[PDB]
Design a protein around this ligand. Structure first.
Ligand SMILES: Cc1cc2nc3c(=O)[nH]c(=O)nc-3n(C[C@H](O)[C@H](O)[C@H](O)COP(=O)(O)OP(=O)(O)OC[C@H]3O[C@@H](n4cnc5c(N)ncnc54)[C@H](O)[C@@H]3O)c2cc1C
Ligand SMILES: Cc1cc2nc3c(=O)[nH]c(=O)nc-3n(C[C@H](O)[C@H](O)[C@H](O)COP(=O)(O)OP(=O)(O)OC[C@H]3O[C@@H](n4cnc5c(N)ncnc54)[C@H](O)[C@@H]3O)c2cc1C
Ligand SMILES: Cc1cc2nc3c(=O)[nH]c(=O)nc-3n(C[C@H](O)[C@H](O)[C@H](O)COP(=O)(O)OP(=O)(O)OC[C@H]3O[C@@H](n4cnc5c(N)ncnc54)[C@H](O)[C@@H]3O)c2cc1C
Ligand SMILES: Cc1cc2nc3c(=O)[nH]c(=O)nc-3n(C[C@H](O)[C@H](O)[C@H](O)COP(=O)(O)OP(=O)(O)OC[C@H]3O[C@@H](n4cnc5c(N)ncnc54)[C@H](O)[C@@H]3O)c2cc1C
Ligand SMILES: OC[C@H]1O[C@@H](c2ccc(Cl)c(Cc3ccc(O[C@H]4CCOC4)cc3)c2)[C@H](O)[C@@H](O)[C@@H]1O
Lengths: 383, 385, 387, 385
């Protein structure tokens, strides 16, 4: 259930991840951001704990957990480091997720199992320079020739691009079929015909890598296709439905640690004779931050539990992602404000939380796309 | 319409029963109840027969033996039908029966609970006074012991069901020098010598409910009319409001849900620039924000109910739910008017009523500002723990 | 005319006009506002007194019986009057901007003498019939028609939502003279009330501005003289739009009055209500609400005065009038909502005026183009500016 | 662009001169200034030669002989180009020269204003301390009289231009018993014996300005370094802040404008779903809301500037301008990032920088919370008149 008693596997998992975060991520979070340093040693240890492959079956090397467990772990990890959070989220939902749900027995053996322990991680390449929200406009092409698919085109904004050893790539096998002409492919990295673009210099989550995947006469075997030709758009969308629960959970952790920072500070900063928490406006700020965060967690857990129970969860996932991301930006903004001048400098982690929060309103579907998704499903329920 | 969580089949069936009752008995009368300020007597009687006026009361006392999750679901479905009918039911459940269940004697429960579980008699809750609402502990109505009697003097203000209730849980200071350790709770019959009703308030909304002062002038009641012991009245009132706030949260969910229902149905059939309003992206975004606000507040509300059912602390969670639901009901009913356009402003559509009805949920059983104080205090305590 | 500095200190004539309308509102309007609302009573005697003061024809030349003032003066007066009574404000705003406005701007000298002059003294007022039951936000979709027949036009169709419908003696009516031309096939017509062919619909029962009448005008083969057309055929769409640009300044000013009187009520109440041992104004949350109310009100007024002065200075003001109407209308609802909240229980009942101010404010977000329409207007003109 | 009712020809030409300077000298360096946290010395010197560092300063003292309306327009156009350059400029104008001009002697103006009007030397303003920024009056840095000199002890905090300034206006307590009324203001050369600079702060934004503590240890200055009489320090600080808040409001206007500039050009040239972004209703509504927030905040700002120019009271008005402009800058820069999508999160575009620069305007020269307190105080005092 929801806060109303968690199962004890999930409660133990919560404490496990919270212990890992505070011991292994809190002391490195500031350096990862300032040095834009990929946290390889921390990622490997998380692999050992099963956090990089949580809903993956144990026979494939995964933890055998569920998406409520994933959501809890994503929050605790992201509370400690937002970049570490997104690295983990991409491996779980966006890379392993579609291969589990749509892959061959042999594709799972070759592409899931070597990516469950933290020695290798994957990435997800849907967006392109000309189109992100308009995912169905993918114009990277895949052409069948001989025993190969031949890939040509640029994918953009690919998280883990510089550290991953495989990608789920969406390319159009016939642009005239529009979002029925997209297919999904498993692409090893590195590979001939594939070049990495320059790393993006980002506002936040600076410990993750983000770079273009440039395909030029890139040949991969025919059986690299995930599913059948034309399934790619559905594969991408059902993958993002799961991924959005991950990003919602990341935002929950950014929000929680920004709120932790503000409460501790306000309890010890003195003004006009008393701690800041004696001022009414400060109490109201804290109350509204706690309300935004706790209700967005309820939405997140609802989406996660619907998925686990094999129920439709597209609208609920979108709601959780929208609510958590906007709450993470509003809470991190008010945490800066509560710190005052100290909110604006590196002596405190509030300015970093604000920068990290801002991305959760953009990737895996902007807040605008989330609102469209919610409207679409709301109206169908009334029909 | 929401697809949320794992409902027990008992509560799934209760939702359908209540929704069917509301659509069949409440929807046709909501406009008349509001426009004519008409207490919906026949429907309250019928709800009483169903167990809706005494949901959390044990069956051996005449109640339905349900839980507070069931109460929240019923309150939403009923208030969706009629916002006045909702509050009337919520007062009887949380604010009148609730404290007597939790603090009464055996003799008090069989005398003051059981006859108020079927819809032939309802009660009310009298804490606020003209000089003080939010500052509840400033109650200056007095109760003085004399002979075999308590003697009550003073005016309670804003009492919902004042003109239809047959009993009241009244809070009065047995010694004002003790401040909010000087309040006591009393069971008072209505009517009774020494008690006069003030004129009914002319309200913005919830027009079906009566609201009026209770004016005590040398009003004598039996010595054993006291609920609890002298001086625990303040805590009786606060623990009662903690439970009532889940009711008002659920009332706000109903208003919000029926305002959204109204907006969707209208936007699907109103044509503009060649097509239904639901083809306009701006209208889609309004509806999505309304659905999110509503479904968010319901999860908060259900959490507080389920927490109380599991005997866990729930003061902070009850206040969050009441706060979120009430501000959502005002926001959603505002945007439902807006989606209807000119028709949103006229009495032959229900949207302007929902907006008037919503507004009260931000005020009573503790204003939004009090809820934020309550939330902040408990949040801070949790961090010091 | 109008220096930039006059937005910061009014010309003495405008400062005098403010005090004069405020005195009038508090003496004549404050005592009756609640009655006008609860009884849905057209305030005929007060509109007459305002007509004698020039407030019903502020922009009208003195030569034609008007006050000979400008739109800055009109906005100041609309605020003070609406602070007294929101209904009286709208009634005054329709006559100034929506009825007289288009006739001064697009009429011949003959038409002004016949249709402006008898409507400048408060004995007759006008109205503006653009909306129809099937279309309020797209003016251009007028299905009411006007067909030429000899020395007459013949009007057929139902206009909807007409403020002053049950009290006006003339209407500016928009009708399609060429359906095929859509947007360029609309024309504007001066119509007498009563007149054969015209039936009034039932009055609408509304949330607020209850003192004003709102009803359909039903035209069934209704004939009017040929020179009733305002401008030339096809100009109706431009006339409606340019009229609504002026009218939006009037509605912004009405919203300012509703907001100001709601804020007046909240300050007086919070200063004299105690809680937890001190006035409400000692509570930090209350101070913040009041400050937020004042900011929203004062910036919306600066937007409104800007639009008025631009119009007075013969500059474009479509975007600026839309910003003013949008800002002031949303400020009126937010401020009136927070005034209720500051009053607590008293904010929900008729003992106090706060709940009425909430209901009155709600209309300003809808009429003369909803807030959504205002944002579309603002966006279109912002993009034109960058091009 | 926006509209204004006729600006004087003076100010129209100033706007164009300042916009030309910003687009030619500041736009090409803005990214480097931010990324390398590099003080824009050559540009500041050029601005000094134009009069921009001493705008409301009499020409006979080396200034431009302009007014605060002109200052607000120049602040906006400069900050539209570089938010760091804007604050460096705003500190010299309002925070350093302002109080010397308003409270200084003929001789103090000659020695402390004139050498700081041409960009060769700039000043700074030291009121905050590590333990108190909002609580102004709680200044624990002391200044004791020692015959014909003053001796200062204590640490001032968060001083912008600290590492580039040749003089500070420093506030220190000359009578700690007198609290609010025992503060004084002092003109301090930089560098000077007894003064040490803290390490530069590493900041979210305006990274081209320097920010550091000023540490006074037995720092001796002549007797006529005091501005005004002993005890006038708190008033000098508050009236200086009233002026500076118009400067920060204008800085925020320029950050807001350049963010909206970037979003409009981007949305007009980015396609999605077969059409430009500006064909989407939600994008149109964002842009309209950004435009409205910016233009109304500028009107509030110009009102405060003109009142000051006309020597009318302007405390509430400056606080409203600063509050509205600063919250607008954050909201507008936020929505600019959103309109750009992925491009809003990276240095390929300048939106992420604008987001970071805007954030400081809600904090310094009085947080939004303090601004609301100032507004509330003067509203109530006006009502009590
Ligand atoms: C740090 C980072 C990491 C990323 N990692 C990945 C990754 O691993 N894999 C991957 O596939 N992608 C990734 N992306 C891409 C990301 O998902 C996109 O940025 C986003 O989904 C699409 O936005 P866009 O950048 O193309 O902007 P655009 O799609 O051009 O959107 C521009 C604006 O239009 C708005 N808009 C409003 N209404 C509509 C409407 N009806 N239709 C369309 N747009 C509308 C959008 O909300 C946005 O404000 C990443 C992006 C970032 C910034
Ligand atoms: C329709 C209706 C029915 C009602 N029914 C009942 C009933 O059946 N039983 C009953 O007992 N009561 C009832 N009430 C009373 C109701 O609960 C009060 O109206 C409410 O608690 C607030 O009290 P007040 O009216 O005294 O406002 P005030 O307490 O005077 O409050 C005024 C303003 O100050 C604010 N404020 C107060 N204290 C603080 C603080 N410490 N910090 C910050 N802000 C503060 C408030 O939030 C509010 O905005 C009813 C009220 C209404 C309107
Ligand atoms: C009290 C009152 C008095 C009135 N008085 C007058 C009068 O004197 N004269 C007169 O001519 N009219 C009058 N009206 C009509 C009024 O101007 C219209 O109500 C209003 O403009 C909206 O039209 P509508 O009611 O048809 O709503 P609709 O146009 O149906 O709009 C419904 C919803 O869709 C939105 N919408 C519509 N078009 C678009 C679009 N393109 N993009 C996005 N959203 C859109 C709207 O904003 C609204 O939320 C009055 C109305 C009222 C309530
Ligand atoms: C980049 C930068 C440059 C600066 N430059 C200068 C400079 O040149 N000169 C200078 O003198 N200072 C300067 N400052 C200091 C700046 O003005 C202060 O940081 C600011 O006024 C807030 O004070 P504080 O940092 O001590 O925060 P605090 O006062 O500790 O504020 C903490 C929080 O409590 C709130 N709060 C405080 N008091 C109250 C109250 N009474 N009621 C309600 N809420 C309250 C605040 O609004 C804030 O949210 C600078 C700061 C920064 C970040
Ligand atoms: O990410 C997805 C997009 O990114 C695009 C992109 C767009 C404009 C520019 Cl100008 C650039 C150059 C650059 C500059 C600076 C860089 O590194 C440091 C140095 C200083 O600060 C940062 C790296 C790259 C790249 C790709 O071209 C596009 O196809 C993708 O849609």
């Amino acid at each position: 259930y929801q806060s109303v008693e968690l199962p004890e596997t999930h409660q133990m998992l919560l404490q496990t991840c919270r212990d890992f975060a505070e011991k292994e991520l809190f002391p490195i979070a500031a350096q990862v951001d300032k040095e834009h340093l990929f946290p390889a040693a921390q990622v490997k240890k998380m692999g050992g704990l099963g956090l990089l492959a949580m809903d993956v079956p144990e026979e494939l090397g995964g933890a055998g957990l569920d998406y409520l467990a994933y959501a809890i772990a994503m929050e605790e990890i992201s509370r400690g480091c937002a970049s570490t959070g997104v690295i983990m989220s991409v491996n779980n939902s966006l890379y392993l997720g579609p291969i589990l749900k749509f892959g061959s027995k042999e594709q799972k053996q070759a592409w899931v199992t070597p990516f469950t322990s933290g020695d290798k991680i994957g990435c997800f390449a849907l967006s392109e320079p000309g189109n992100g929200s308009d995912a169905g406009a993918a114009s990277t092409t895949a052409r069948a020739e001989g025993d190969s698919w031949v890939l040509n085109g640029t994918k953009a904004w690919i998280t883990n691009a510089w550290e991953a050893s495989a990608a789920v790539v969406f390319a159009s096998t016939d642009r005239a079929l529009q979002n029925k002409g997209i297919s999904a492919f498993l692409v090893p990295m590195p590979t001939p015909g594939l070049t990495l673009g320059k790393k993006e210099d980002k506002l936040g989550i600076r410990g993750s890598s983000t770079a273009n995947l440039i395909f030029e006469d890139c040949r991969i075997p025919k059986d690299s296709i995930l599913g059948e030709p034309g399934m790619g758009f559905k594969i991408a969308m059902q993958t993002l439905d799961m991924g959005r629960i991950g990003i919602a959970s990341q935002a929950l952790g950014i929000a929680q640690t920004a709120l932790d920072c503000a409460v501790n500070y306000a309890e010890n900063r003195m003004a006009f004779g008393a701690p800041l928490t004696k001022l009414q406006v400060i109490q109201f700020k804290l109350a509204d931050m706690a309300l935004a965060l706790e209700s967005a967690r309820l939405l997140t857990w609802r989406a996660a539990m619907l998925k686990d129970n094999k129920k439709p969860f597209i609208k609920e996932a979108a709601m959780a992602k929208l609510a958590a991301s906007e709450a993470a930006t509003a809470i991190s903004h008010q945490a800066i404000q509560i710190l005052g001048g100290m909110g604006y400098v590196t002596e405190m982690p509030a300015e970093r939380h604000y920068r990290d929060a801002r991305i959760t309103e953009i990737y895996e579907g902007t807040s605008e796309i989330q609102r469209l998704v919610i409207a679409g499903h709301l109206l169908r329920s009334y029909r």
